[PDB]
Amino acid sequence: PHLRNRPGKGHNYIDGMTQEDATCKPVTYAGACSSFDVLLEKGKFPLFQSYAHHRTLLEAVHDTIIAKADPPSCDLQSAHGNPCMKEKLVMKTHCPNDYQSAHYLNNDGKMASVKCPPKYELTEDCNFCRQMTGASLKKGSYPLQDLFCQSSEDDGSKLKTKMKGVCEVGVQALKKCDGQLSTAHEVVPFAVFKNSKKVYLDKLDLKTEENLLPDSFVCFEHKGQYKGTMDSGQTKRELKSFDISQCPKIGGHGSKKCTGDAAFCSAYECTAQYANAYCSHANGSGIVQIQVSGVWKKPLCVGYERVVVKRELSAKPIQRVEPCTTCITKCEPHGLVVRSTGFKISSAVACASGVCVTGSQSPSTEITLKYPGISQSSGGDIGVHMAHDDQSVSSKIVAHCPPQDPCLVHGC
Amino acid sequence: CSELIQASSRITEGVNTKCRLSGTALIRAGSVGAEACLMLKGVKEDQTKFLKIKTVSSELSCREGQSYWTGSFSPKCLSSRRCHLVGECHVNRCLSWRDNETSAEFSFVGESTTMRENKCFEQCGGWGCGCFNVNPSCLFVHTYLQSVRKEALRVFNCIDWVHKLTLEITDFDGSVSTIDLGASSSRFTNWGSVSLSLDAEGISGSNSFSFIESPGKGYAIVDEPFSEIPRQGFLGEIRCNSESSVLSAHESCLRAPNLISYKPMIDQLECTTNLIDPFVVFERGSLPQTRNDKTFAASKGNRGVQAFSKGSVQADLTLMFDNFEVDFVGAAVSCDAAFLNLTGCYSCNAGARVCLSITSTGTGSLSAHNKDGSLHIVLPSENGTKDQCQILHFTVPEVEEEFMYSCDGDERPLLVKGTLIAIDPFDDRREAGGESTVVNPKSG
Numbered sequence: 001p002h003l004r005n006r007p008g009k010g011h012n013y014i015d016g017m018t019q020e021d022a023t024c025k026p027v028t029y030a031g032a033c034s035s036f037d038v039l040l041e042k043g044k045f046p047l048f049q050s051y052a053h054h055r056t057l058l059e060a061v062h063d064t065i066i067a068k069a070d071p072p073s074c075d076l077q078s079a080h081g082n083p084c085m086k087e088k089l090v091m092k093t094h095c096p097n098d099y100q101s102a103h104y105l106n107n108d109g110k111m112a113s114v115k116c117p118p119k120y121e122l123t124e125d126c127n128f129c130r131q132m133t134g135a136s137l138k139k140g141s142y143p144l145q146d147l148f149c150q151s152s153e154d155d156g157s158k159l160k161t162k163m164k165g166v167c168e169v170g171v172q173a174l175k176k177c178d179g180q181l182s183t184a185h186e187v188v189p190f191a192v193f194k195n196s197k198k199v200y201l202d203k204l205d206l207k208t209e210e211n212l213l214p215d216s217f218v219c220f221e222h223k224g225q226y227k228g229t230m231d232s233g234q235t236k237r238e239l240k241s242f243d244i245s246q247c248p249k250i251g252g253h254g255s256k257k258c259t260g261d262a263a264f265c266s267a268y269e270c271t272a273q274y275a276n277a278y279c280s281h282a283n284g285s286g287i288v289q290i291q292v293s294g295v296w297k298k299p300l301c302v303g304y305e306r307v308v309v310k311r312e313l314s315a316k317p318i319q320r321v322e323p324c325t326t327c328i329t330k331c332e333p334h335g336l337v338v339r340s341t342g343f344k345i346s347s348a349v350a351c352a353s354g355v356c357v358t359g360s361q362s363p364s365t366e367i368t369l370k371y372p373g374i375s376q377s378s379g380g381d382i383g384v385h386m387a388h389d390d391q392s393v394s395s396k397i398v399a400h401c402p403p404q405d406p407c408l409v410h411g412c
Numbered sequence: 413c414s415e416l417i418q419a420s421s422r423i424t425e426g427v428n429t430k431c432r433l434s435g436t437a438l439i440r441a442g443s444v445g446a447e448a449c450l451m452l453k454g455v456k457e458d459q460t461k462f463l464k465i466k467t468v469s470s471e472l473s474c475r476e477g478q479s480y481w482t483g484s485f486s487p488k489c490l491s492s493r494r495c496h497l498v499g500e501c502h503v504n505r506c507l508s509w510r511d512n513e514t515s516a517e518f519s520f521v522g523e524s525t526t527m528r529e530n531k532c533f534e535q536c537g538g539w540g541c542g543c544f545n546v547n548p549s550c551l552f553v554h555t556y557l558q559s560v561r562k563e564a565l566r567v568f569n570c571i572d573w574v575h576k577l578t579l580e581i582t583d584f585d586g587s588v589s590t591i592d593l594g595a596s597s598s599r600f601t602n603w604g605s606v607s608l609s610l611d612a613e614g615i616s617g618s619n620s621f622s623f624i625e626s627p628g629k630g631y632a633i634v635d636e637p638f639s640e641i642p643r644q645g646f647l648g649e650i651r652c653n654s655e656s657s658v659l660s661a662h663e664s665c666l667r668a669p670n671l672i673s674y675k676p677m678i679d680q681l682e683c684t685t686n687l688i689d690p691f692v693v694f695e696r697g698s699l700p701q702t703r704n705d706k707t708f709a710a711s712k713g714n715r716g717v718q719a720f721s722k723g724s725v726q727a728d729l730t731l732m733f734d735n736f737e738v739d740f741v742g743a744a745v746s747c748d749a750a751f752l753n754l755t756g757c758y759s760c761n762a763g764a765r766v767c768l769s770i771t772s773t774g775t776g777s778l779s780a781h782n783k784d785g786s787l788h789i790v791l792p793s794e795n796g797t798k799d800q801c802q803i804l805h806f807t808v809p810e811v812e813e814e815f816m817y818s819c820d821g822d823e824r825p826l827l828v829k830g831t832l833i834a835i836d837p838f839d840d841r842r843e844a845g846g847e848s849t850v851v852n853p854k855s856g
């Protein structure tokens with residue numbers, strides 16, 4: 001249970017729901033917090049479970065990393081007639097039972113939550129409040145989105161949503177479109193930067209780089225340990241969290257003797273006397289950087305949603321119209337010759353009342369062909385199909401010819 | 413041109429008493445543009461209903477075998493670099509990464525039907541690379557293909573070519589009937605059925621090419637054999653079974669191994685590939701094309717491909733149970749005719765074109781017959797002066813004959829003049845023959 005050694009204060013509680021301060025004020029190996037234990041269930045919240053040693057939304061809020069929205073959480077008991085549930089109703093979520101509250105990161109990059117009236121619980125889609133008699137509601141709030149938060153100083157005031165072929169994602173109106181509008185629920189990764197709003201992304205590529213800052217170390221201490229806090233006889237072997245702000249930095253001063261692994265000893269001053277706490281290195285921590293518009297940036301925090309996107313499938317798939325007539329067709333006693341413009345003709349076929357005749361030649365602006373059947377003697381109309389080198393030129397043309405005299409053709 | 417005396421019925425003044433003529437008829441099918449002729453004679457100056465089966469055209473259609481679809485695809489990649497011992501960056505996990513298996517970092521993708529693969533690459537391990545550990549780190553890449561253009565191409569092959577005859581059936585009192593049928597096949601038309609023998613050749617070999625069909629745009633030919641297994645660097649490297657699968661890059665589409673080129677250079681990953689644009693190849697070999705004297709081209713109606721090869725066939729279509737008669741035709745009609753000209757050749761497949769000026773007071777037909785009965789001329793007669801044409805066969809350089817023409821009335825003398833051109837074969841042994849020639853190229 002090393003994941004319960006939270007970075008920073010580890011305050012996994014929300015304002016108003018302060019009935020679980022025994023175990024939700026700093027989250028430790030001992031208790032059980034309703035607003036945190038859901039994150040560690042197998043198969044749920046996999047993105048945070050991968051980045052398990054980064055702050056949650058509530059933790060980031062309590063460290064002043066992420067601000068709190070204006071109507072911080074308009075209670076449905078007192079504000080069910082106000083335009084509150086606008087960003088919530090565009091998301092597709094799934095809450096478990098016996099939960100009276102649920103918090104999410106709104107569009108402006110702040111934290112807002114939905115609180116059902118007392119003794120009511122949130123339904124399976126977190127959209128309605130339902131009252132079940134004789135039910136014990138949990139004391140925490142369900143994290144709606146799957147996200148992990150960190151502290152950043154990189155500025156992102158010029159960052160904006162840039163998705164191709166999207167007219168509207170979530171509650172953001174990307175542009176104005178007319179015509180067909182494909183509408184569906186999609187999993188859209190997002191990120192929030194300093195002095196910015198939510199920035200939905202098309203591709204989620206990110207990297208982490210480790211460091212030796214205090215948030216990268218997991219200090220603990222045994223319960224009942226000699227010459228330590230809570231130094232009394234015990235009946236169970238359990239750990240206890242330790243604050244790294246006490247162990248002295250290298251070449252510095254501190255209040256508690258501290259020991260640890262190689263990474264801790266390389267940055268802090270590992271003691272030579274009896275140690276008070278063991279400070280290892282959070283094996284997954286570091287600084288996570290996102291790539292937006294090719295350039296890497298440091299987000300306040302990233303996640304993903306299930307919002308409704310209004311795409312545009314197509315304006316026009318393809319247009320195939322070509323009534324081209326840039327050719328001259330003049331029947332000649334020597335042969336059927338058609339003179340065309342710049343586009344060259346390699347092979348052609350001539351059809352006149354069933355019987356057809358074909359010709360092949362190198363690409364040229366003109367081609368001569370033998371007359372099909374008795375069309376030379378009888379004249380009439382003759383259709384010609386040819387293969388142009390270019391495109392957008394009609395391949396079916398018709399030539400009108402009067403009756404001809406074979407004597408000139410065979411004259412010798 | 414042939415009678416039906418074996419099963420002739422009594423086609424009461426005016427009223428019709430047709431007995432559903434059951435006797436079949438056997439007449440050799442005429443050449444291309446010619447017609448097949450019938451004699452429903454009743455009482456002189458009455459009846460004489462003519463059934464005409466005009467030979468529209470003969471084409472060497474294609475019998476398609478296997479087929480598949482393809483389009484233009486472009487890849488997109490998602491990367492996630494984690495240090496050693498983080499997640500599943502164990503050397504064994506990084507090396508054994510099964511493309512079919514997805515990493516836990518790109519779980520927002522979740523379940524999807526897009527064609528996709530997953531790769532894992534090692535990078536530097538050490539404080540210079542970015543990780544305190546010295547064992548190599550990992551870079552998980554998820555790549556999925558997406559379609560660029562909203563179009564697809566169908567690629568098929570012709571296992572064999574079949575002779576196919578198009579006939580214009582000029583039924584009794586109305587010529588609205590066109591039928592297309594192959595060799596040794598029957599078509600259940602009105603008044604029974606029509607069957608074609610075409611005993612000469614039911615096939616014209618095979619080939620080793622493949623044809624592209626763009627829906628609503630035309631056809632094309634590629635100079636490669638049709639391969640049922642995808643191959644890198646050829647057409648159909650990525651192939652599907654439907655246009656929807658192509659336009660959505662569905663995972664059911666097959667593709668060759670090692671199509672995506674990965675450049676894991678330390679700053680940014682580069683996911684790219686070199687793929688043959690099927691649209692370029694389609695535009696390159698547009699249909700109107702000639703290969704070793706075959707000249708494949710789009711069939712009339714744009715529903716397939718043809719094969720213009722030198723040859724000819726013998727066709728003997730058989731009518732059966734032909735019965736289409738009414739009672740209003742019992743009245744006689746007057747008609748007049750005037751000879752116009754004579755053009756064409758002799759002893760030739762094309763024949764000699766015969767045109768006649770018809771001046772009639774109403775609906776009717778023409779039954780000009782020569783003295784010996786060898787040559788028959790039939791032309792419909794309509795109100796006012798009309799100019800209709802017919803096609804006959806001759807074996808004389810000059811034509812000078814008289815025909816007993818009568819449009820359901822009295823026979824009057826119709827005289828035809830003119831000479832016929834000579835089809836220089838610059839190569840003759842004893843004769844030419846009519847047969848039924850399928851279209852052929854110049855290089856034959």
Ligand SMILES: *[C@@H]1O[C@H](CO)[C@@H](O[C@@H]2O[C@H](CO)[C@@H](O[C@@H]3O[C@H](CO)[C@@H](O)[C@H](O)[C@H]3NC(C)=O)[C@H](O)[C@H]2NC(C)=O)[C@H](O)[C@H]1NC(C)=O
Binds near residue numbers: 401767799
């Ligand atoms: C032998 O006489 C035939 C019968 O007149 C001619 O064959 C065709 O005659 C048609 C009408 O009798 C003509 O149709 C005309 O076509 C022109 C232009 O193509 C248009 O004005 C109309 O479609 C039509 N005009 C009408 C109905 O008044 C054909 O022009 C004609 N075919 C041709 C081109 O020969 C022959 O002309 C004639 N043979 C010889 C050797 O001259």
Ligand SMILES: *[C@@H]1O[C@H](CO)[C@@H](O)[C@H](O)[C@H]1NC(C)=O
Binds near residue numbers: 050284498
């Ligand atoms: C390393 O961290 C991952 C989560 O980031 C954890 O699953 C794994 O157990 C850790 N390795 C250890 C503790 O050896």
Ligand SMILES: *[C@@H]1O[C@H](CO)[C@@H](O)[C@H](O)[C@H]1NC(C)=O
Binds near residue numbers: 514
């Ligand atoms: C694909 O992966 C799944 C789970 O990762 C596995 O059950 C299945 O056997 C794999 N199929 C292969 C390797 O062909």
